[PDB]
Each structure stands twice: as structure tokens, then as C-alpha cells.
Amino acid sequence: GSAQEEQSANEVAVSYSKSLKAAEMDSLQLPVDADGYITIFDGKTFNGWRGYGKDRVPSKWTIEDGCIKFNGSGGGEAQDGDGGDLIFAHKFKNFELEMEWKVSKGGNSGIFYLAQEVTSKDKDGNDVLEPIYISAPEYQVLDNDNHPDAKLGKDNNRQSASLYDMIPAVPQNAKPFGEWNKAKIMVYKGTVVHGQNDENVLEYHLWTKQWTDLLQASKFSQDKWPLAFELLNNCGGENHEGFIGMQDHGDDVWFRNIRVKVLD
Ligand SMILES: [K+]
Ligand SMILES: [K+]
Numbered sequence: 598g599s600a601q602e603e604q605s606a607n608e609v610a611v612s613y614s615k616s617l618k619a620a621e622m623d624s625l626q627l628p629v630d631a632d633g634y635i636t637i638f639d640g641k642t643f644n645g646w647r648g649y650g651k652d653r654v655p656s657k658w659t660i661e662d663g664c665i666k667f668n669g670s671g672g673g674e675a676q677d678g679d680g681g682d683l684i685f686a687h688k689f690k691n692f693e694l695e696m697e698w699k700v701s702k703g704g705n706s707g708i709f710y711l712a713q714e715v716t717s718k719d720k721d722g723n724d725v726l727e728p729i730y731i732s733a734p735e736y737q738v739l740d741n742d743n744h745p746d747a748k749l750g751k752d753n754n755r756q757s758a759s760l761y762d763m764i765p766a767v768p769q770n771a772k773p774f775g776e777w778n779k780a781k782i783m784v785y786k787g788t789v790v791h792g793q794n795d796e797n798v799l800e801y802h803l804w805t806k807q808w809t810d811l812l813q814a815s816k817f818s819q820d821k822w823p824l825a826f827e828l829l830n831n832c833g834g835e836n837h838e839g840f841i842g843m844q845d846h847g848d849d850v851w852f853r854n855i856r857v858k859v860l861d
Contacts, residue, residue: 604628609635613645613686616652617726618714621687630856634695637685637841638665638855649682649842650714650726657845658683665855667706669848676845682729684712684842690833691860693783694841699851702774703743707761707844709733710782711833714840717824729842731817731825734832735761736782736791738843738850740774758793763811766791766798777853785860787837803832 609629612621625645628636637645640663648655657680659666670677689710700706712733716724737759741747746755750762758766758780770793772778781792787803802808809830812818817825833839843852 611635611637611645611687615647615686617650617716633858634693634856635858636856637687638853640664640853645687646683646685649684649712649729649840651681654683655679655681655845657681661851664851664853665843666852667843667845667848667850669701669704669845669850672847673705675847677847680845680847682709682842682845684709684729684840685855686840688836688838688840689784689857689859690836690838691785693781693785693858693860694856695779695781696855697777697779697853698738699777700738700740700774701849702740704738704740704774704848704850705744705746705846706738706848706850707846708736708738708780708782709840709842709844710736711784711837711839712842713828713834715824715828727824729844731822732828732832732834733839733842734789734829735844736780737761737766738780739771741769741771742773758791758798760789760791760799760801763815764799764801766793768796768798770794770796770798782841783860804830804837808832 608626610624611627612624614621643654657668712729715727719725737757739757741756749755752765754765757771779794783790789801790797791799812829819826
């Protein structure tokens with residue numbers, strides 16, 4: 598029948614949550630292509646998106662020219678002002694995400710996945726929000742030629758599309774600052790693959806001895822950061838699932854064409 602009815606036919610109900618650790622008790626009708634990718638950013642609104650830990654989108658995240666933009670002040674991990682990491686508030690388990698990203702000269706951001714909203718108790722019994730990165734693996738987003746982090750870590754494991762500070766992207770086929778790069782993150786039954794610019798650049802396996810050993814060699818080791826170790830070692834929590842999101846690392850960055858295929 599109508600264009601409206603055909604559109605409703607080529608759409609799927611996608612649950613989302615509205616605030617810290619809330620149930621996903623509302624749904625968006627989102628477009629799906631023939632390959633099964635759900636477009637999760639519509640080019641115009643933040644529907645389904647919110648700050649990690651928040652009930653709203655921080656004002657440092659804007660929409661511009663069909664992109665999600667983070668507007669940075671230059672303070673790295675500080676997350677000053679009305680910032681913070683952004684999530685699409687729908688937990689995925691087995692999925693393939695594709696999106697494009699572009700950084701400013703010298704810029705740094707990241708794509709998080711399998712994220713959990715985590716709090717801990719302070720000395721007075723009050724809940725405190727823990728960083729997204731103590732639960733969520735990080736796909737690096739970087740100007741590999743100008744941000745000095747590119748030269749740090751080991752074997753270029755802090756360059757774009759790396760599992761940040763843990764496993765390097767090989768080949769390192771990033772395009773330079775100001776150009777669009779294509780990211781792929783696939784999680785399927787614990788196998789994780791990163792892609793960049795239509796090439797697979799690393800592979801790893803969650804919930805294995807090898808994964809534990811990698812974490813024990815990281816800043817999230819059991820000795821250095823017990824809570825992070827516990828969360829990452831059983832990445833995704835009891836149900837092995839979580840949110841996709843993007844990082845406030847204080848620098849201008851743009852994201853577009855954000856789509857996710859649910860794998861079974
Ligand atoms: K929203
Ligand atoms: K980063």
C-alpha cells in the first residue's frame with residue numbers, strides 16, 4: 598500500500614533505556630537494510646542516545662551535517678564542562694557494528710562496546726559512577742600522525758582501530774586527519790574482530806585464558822584495578838552484552854553512518 602506502510606514494514610522495534618541502569622522499556626522504530634543492518638543514528642536526532650550514566654545528552658555532543666559531533670575543549674581525559682561519554686542505550690550481544698569517524702588534527706576519541714553502566718560505593722555508602730572504560734573494550738580513534746599517544750604503548754597498539762593499549766591494528770591503514778575512516782566491530786560468541794577501511798585489523802577472544810592474560814598485562818590488571826579486572830574479565834556481565842558508545846577525550850570528532858546488524 599502506502600509509502601508509510603512499506604516504511605513500517607522495513608523497520609524493527611529497538612528497545613532503549615532512558616537513564617542510569619534503567620530497564621529498556623521503550624522502543625524506537627528503526628530502519629533495517631536487506632543485509633540486516635539497523636541504522637541507529639538517523640542523521641537528525643539523538644533518539645535512543647544519552648550520556649553514559651545520564652538521563653540526557655550532554656550539550657558537548659551535537660548533531661551537525663548528518664553527523665554526531667563531540668565538541669572538545671582540549672583537556673584529554675578531564676571530561677570538563679557538559680561532556681562525558683555517549684551511549685546508544687540498547688544492549689547488544691552478538692552484533693556487527695559499522696560506522697565512520699573523522700578526527701581533528703591531533704584528535705583522539707574512541708568507540709566503546711559491550712559497555713555496562715557501573716557504580717561503586719564511596720566511603721559514605723553513596724553510589725559513584727565508574728568510567729565506561731572499566732567495562733567496555735575500546736576501539737581507538739586517533740590522528741595517528743599527530744597525537745603523541747600514537748607513539749606510546751607497544752607495537753603501535755594505541756593507534757586507530759587498535760584494542761587500546763592491548764592489541765595493535767595490523768595493517769595500520771588509517772586515512773589521515775580530516776578524512777573519513779570506516780570502523781567495524783564484530784562480536785560473535787566471544788570472537789571479536791576490529792576492521793578499519795574495509796580490512797580486518799585484529800582478532801581476539803573474550804572470556805579465555807588469553808583474554809585474562811592480556812588484562813593482567815594491562816592497566817586494568819587484578820592488582821592495579823580489581824573492579825576493572827572483574828568487569829572486563831567477564832566482559833558484558835552475566836548476560837555477555839552491553840552498549841556501543843563513543844568517547845569524550847576532549848577533542849573534536851565526527852561520527853556518521855552508524856549501523857548495527859544483530860547476529861545469531
Ligand atoms: K535522547
Ligand atoms: K581514545
